[PDB]
Amino acid sequence: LDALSPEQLVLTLLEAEPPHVLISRPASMMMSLTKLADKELVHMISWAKKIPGFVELSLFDQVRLLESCWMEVLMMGLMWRSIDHPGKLIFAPDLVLDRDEGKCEGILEIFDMLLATTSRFRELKLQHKEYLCVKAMILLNSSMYPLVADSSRKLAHLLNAVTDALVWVIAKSGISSQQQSMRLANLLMLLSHVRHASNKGMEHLLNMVVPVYDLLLEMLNAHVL
């Protein structure tokens, strides 16, 4: 109830944000990168557990959602981290990248998908409160199977609340009702792009390094046991 209310929901999400992850280095890009994800994934699962109502869904649903959405959530965080640095990607404190470093490959393709989309978010002037709500939407909207009898009723309620909070945030800008709808529409259309980049990253990842998708699956098990 209360916890799912716009002002509160948004401040609960703020405290649930994952920490800075240091890669901690003593196929090097891809070595750096896969070790990073392994690290980031642990925190991702913690983050999800702090989203009001998520742990009360079915574990059959929790596991489905985290499995399908991990790369879009790590990419959404990445764009938010690089949003002010045109030309770069800020993967972590000691791991920043130039586009011309994405020349050594296949990675260059993905690199430009993430710079472009990020530039789009810059132009829209993505607010923190907006960022927090969209990343939560990405997790809850990541699959359709899990919302095809109570956990479903629950999943929708919890997804509708987040959409309510975003709408709320936007209404506070003091813009016109038409601007509101145009902004809500521009924001959610951008998720289609996010998913695209995710699909490509996932693709690149099987054509190959650390067992990110393995261990995660493993983390998913312990998460159940």
Ligand X SMILES: CCCC[C@@]12CCC(=O)C(Br)=C1c1ccc(O)cc1C2
76 binds, among a second copy, ligand X, none (CB under 5 to 8 A by kind): none
Contacts of 55 (CB under 8 A, 6+ apart): 49, 62
For 47-181, strand residue ranges (E) read: 88-92, 95-98
Measured CA to CA in angstroms, residue 187 lies from 159, 163, 181, 194, 217 at distances of 16, 11, 10, 11, 31
193 binds, among ligand X, a second copy, none (CB under 5 to 8 A by kind): a second copy
- Toward ligand X, which CB reaches closer, 46 or 173? 46
In the complex, the residues that contact ligand X under the rule CB under 6 A are 33-34, 36-37, 40, 74-75, 78, 91, 102, 107, 110-111, 114, 201, 204-205, 212
Min CB(84)–a second copy separation in Å: 17
Binding mask 125-164 for a second copy (x = CB under 8 A): ------------x---x--xx--x-----------x--xx
- Toward ligand X, which CB reaches closer, 50 or 103? 103
- Toward ligand X, which CB reaches closer, 7 or 84? 84
Binding mask 164-203 for a second copy (x = CB under 8 A): x-xx----------x--xx-xx--xx-xxxxxx--xx--x
107 binds, among ligand X, a second copy, none (CB under 5 to 8 A by kind): ligand X
Residue 117 lies near a second copy (rule: CB under 8 A)? yes
17 binds, among a second copy, ligand X, none (CB under 5 to 8 A by kind): none
- Toward ligand X, which CB reaches closer, 111 or 131? 111
Restricting to residues 48-107, which ones interact with a second copy according to CB under 8 A? none
Number of residues that bind a second copy (CB under 8 A): 30
State which residue has the least CB distance to ligand X.
201
How many whole angstroms separate alpha carbon 221 and alpha carbon 225? 6
Question: 171-204 burial string, b = 16+ CB within 10 Å, else e?
Answer: eeeeeeeeeeeebbeebeebeebbbebbebbeee
Number of H helices, E strands in the chain: 8, 2
- Toward ligand X, which CB reaches closer, 114 or 134? 114
Long-range contacts of 67-71 (CB under 8 A, 24+ apart): 67/216, 67/217, 67/220, 68/142, 68/143, 69/138, 69/139, 69/142, 69/143, 70/37, 70/41, 70/44, 70/216, 71/198, 71/201, 71/202
For 68-215, strand residue ranges (E) read: 88-92, 95-98
